[PDB]
């Protein structure tokens, strides 16, 4: 197959209609505006291709066969690598001054007319909390179908060691924290009463249910317990790669926000602020619980931590 | 106009035919291979858009009106910025293992079938020593090196009747090397004195070779030099008097032409590594602006540079 | 000179005291925390070395000799290059998980104890609106001495073409805008309800530029930084940027805005890193002037006025 | 603890003696030369801190307890991230023209830490520096430690899984039917070349000879073990070790890219280097996935140690 025919360059390298040239006088810098956005859209299609493939492995129960954990993590890492290059790609728009942009600004749509469908589809597919025709039907499917957060949440609920009749991680953890706080108290007094309130709040299921309703939490109480199990026992073979998956989900969340930030700055630069946009807020949250390592429940001769499934 | 309609996404986002899926079983990683190369081709079109516009300013004599020097420099810098991102874009291909590449390798063309027309057009347009007609035009038309060469020959201060830069420079170097040789012979018999006499005879041969027009003409014929002797003299004038207003922006242009040359080679290197990584297993000749690198490596001391009287061309533009 | 002796590696490569190891159990990741911040501090010293040198060229009147404009622009570009690498340097902190950071968090100072003097000195020296002793004296000097904004402001007031008796840029500009809006209004008067509404909005924007009293009030509210004459001079360089005399000064204004974007992007990544492990534009006016959508055909024309192509010293 | 006192900034921010300023006239650009190299040396110390800690896990036999595989991989990835930034750090030296460098060149070079790092990875000064350099050359390199560990790879044992025996049988039979398929001009020529490459993998005498000529680094058993991790990378037990091999190759590419940019910078102002050549080599054997010996799910591939 010929290079240009395999790549279908007859479509890609023939889609550059300078609106300034079409509606009057050609403005040289408008070509950079067209190519930079066409390049962003190519990478959004690849990010969607990886995200949808990983979403499928989860929805079709293939994540249960743990031979696929390398594939899932590898593809999630690739999404972060692509996202790192998209943040870098803003350096090319920087080469165009705001004075030169104003020369072709008249031949462009308002801020309303200029909005990406693929980025909206990607945000919905990851699980970011709240176009016509085929675009409107494809957007409806993104909102209807299970988000990556919902699929990861269901998977986190099945985490080994959670079962109260088996390992009973939450029961052991609560007991260890309670007993550790007793011996710590037997001995600063102001900082203890504050520290105790924070650690014990983790076991308040009613508080977590209220925070979920206020949009402050996303994961279910059982998925939150399962994520913490992977956190503490990350060195145990069974949780080594799942820890990398949680790590990657947080990294993707940081990059999604860094891209939205640079894009926002670029709009304010050429034309003249979210904090809760983190889908995996709970994964960041669990990293902040300052439980002393010597209070983490010890690991018994329980074969789950070193035996895999298929 | 709608975002996708202005960007013609109906062509761009509908040009991904996975050959594995077409000829049998779909191989997931093949989509990354298609998009990475399509993304490289989008940036090659933008690099060609900037390069051809700058080439036009030169060929149509607009470079004579110096009000355009900001435009030329700005666009040449943009080419280097885009080139910096294309070297970074290789990090995305790194996410695909050589083992996974082999799964879709059977559904692909040989090393011969896989060759970029736009990169070849770009190399020819910079001046590296229907598709067939467009390639013929790239080789026939004046390269960026040829246009820059002609422009360097018109550099003010070169004229022997006027400033006579080359005559002053040769005189200053000759007299400076004489007093340096004397200083070396004044040193008492030492190990460092014998090393200094040897390093002087080598340093003197390098600096004086700059004034051998017959040697430069011979090296041009052997493919070792690219710029004409007058363009080489003109480039050195911009180098030494870069602080003088008239040469501030032209110095940035020469700087940018060297930067582009370094990036073109770094891209060829990463691409070569990628081929040897997926298929199994730093050239100076590839530098178009070798002479601009060459002039930076002469090392003439600042106090030997001929002095400028402020009753001269260095501050009046055209 | 010996490599390690020239670089004084006996100081640099002997300044790593792991506080976890000192106060009890050594935590491996704490070495990365020490080196990453020591590396940031080396680059802050270099950014201060370039910034102070450029500030000096301005304060000591050397910017008047325009042969130094390449030097000023080159060093300002270098500050942006270094700043671009400091934003990238945050990828190294990313390699340390927040869980591992908590293992050495107990052996560290509060949010008050952890604050950079060099970054504070740099912010003050550019002109952004715990330490004691020699540090407190050096911080007082940063706030007292002329900022890079003040030095650039004074230089912008001297911009050629501003003088009312000479080129009179502001007078010409106001006249041209007023007369251009007259002919545009006439064309419109011939439904076109969106055109008449967009005209009254366009007119309000362009004419606001000539309201000196509004600019003086915005300066007081902290919304503007440059004086009205420095604001006029910056716009002169903007419109006549292609004219040889203003080619390099345009790059300088461009660089001052770029440095401002990078200073904020660094503060952003740093803030995100603190929230990850624990749970402001000085040149606002330069960004502002880029947003005025004046049609290029209304910009006052340049006849045989020798200032645009003759330099000074 | 105060920020500058914890960081010992009294040493770091007071180690800049401009030799131009000391021996006469101060040259502004010389400060950039000092800081850029001091910054490189800070990162070489961190790269050595990570590399030595990983080397210790191997020499200490702690790698046998597979709970440490996350730690080893994580630290090896960190070394590649730091290395990526050192290649980027060359953009700061680019801001200094060769003409300005010549102004301080009269008042003026090989890194001990980079030499120590090259020796510690396994790339084949006087006083305390000479003693520390001797230790780097004497002590077991990261290649030697990885080599010993690769020899213990499960599935290699002929009495057990017998990977090499199965693999040779599968390749031999697959090449027979491929040759037959061809017999029905460029394909016949490319087959004779492809067959020679794949069959050479089972020539232990050829590998032993190439090791002696400096063309190979890993022992035949470590080479067999690396290929086992390559093919069965999806199997849980080999998921993280595959990331380790991947990282060792990535570090090797970055070490070379740094040596390249450094060399270009010296010329601007004035395969043998690959330790893990074998890991690149094994990736280049174009074996079809349907020839890989199948795994019965009554095996070691899912139980850790
Ligand atoms: C067989 C299993 N993959 C078990 C499982 C669930 N969540 C996990 C988290 C980490 C490791 C394993 C799991 C499954 O239930 O899908
Ligand atoms: C008028 C002019 N632009 C002069 C010129 C030519 N080459 C140069 C190099 C540096 C500075 C100026 C020149 C011309 O002759 O085209
Ligand atoms: C001689 C001069 N440099 C003139 C000057 C002032 N501001 C400027 C802006 C752009 C160009 C020139 C100027 C001076 O008075 O400093
Ligand atoms: C118990 C063990 N760590 C097993 C081992 C050795 N080499 C390996 C390679 C990949 C996976 C496992 C191994 C050991 O014997 O070191």
Residue numbers in the entry:
A (entry chain B): 40 to 169, 184 to 240, 253 to 337, 355 to 392
B (entry chain A): 40 to 168, 187 to 338, 355 to 391
C (entry chain D): 40 to 168, 183 to 243, 249 to 337, 359 to 392
D (entry chain C): 40 to 147, 153 to 168, 184 to 243, 251 to 336, 357 to 391
Wording from the paper:
Two steps were essential for successful co-crystallization of apo-TDO. Second, the exosite binder AMT was added to apo-TDO2 because of its stabilizing effect as observed in DSF experiments. An exosite that binds both the substrate Trp and its α-methyl analog AMT has been identified previously in holo-TDO224. AMT led to an improved apo-TDO2 melting curve quality and was therefore included in all apo-TDO2 inhibitor DSF measurements.
Tryptophan-2,3-dioxygenase (TDO2) and indoleamine-2,3-dioxygenase 1 (IDO1) catalyze the same reaction: the conversion of L-tryptophan (Trp) to N-formyl-kynurenine (NFK). Both enzymes evolved to bind heme for substrate binding and catalysis but are structurally distinct: IDO1 is monomeric, while TDO2 is tetrameric with two independent TDO2 molecules contributing to each of its four active sites. The enzymes can adopt an inactive, heme-free (apo) state or an active, heme-containing (holo) state, with the balance between them varying dynamically according to biological conditions. While apo-TDO2 is catalytically inactive, the term “apo-TDO2 inhibitor” is used to describe compounds that bind to apo-TDO2, compete with heme binding and thus prevent the formation of enzymatically active holo-TDO2.
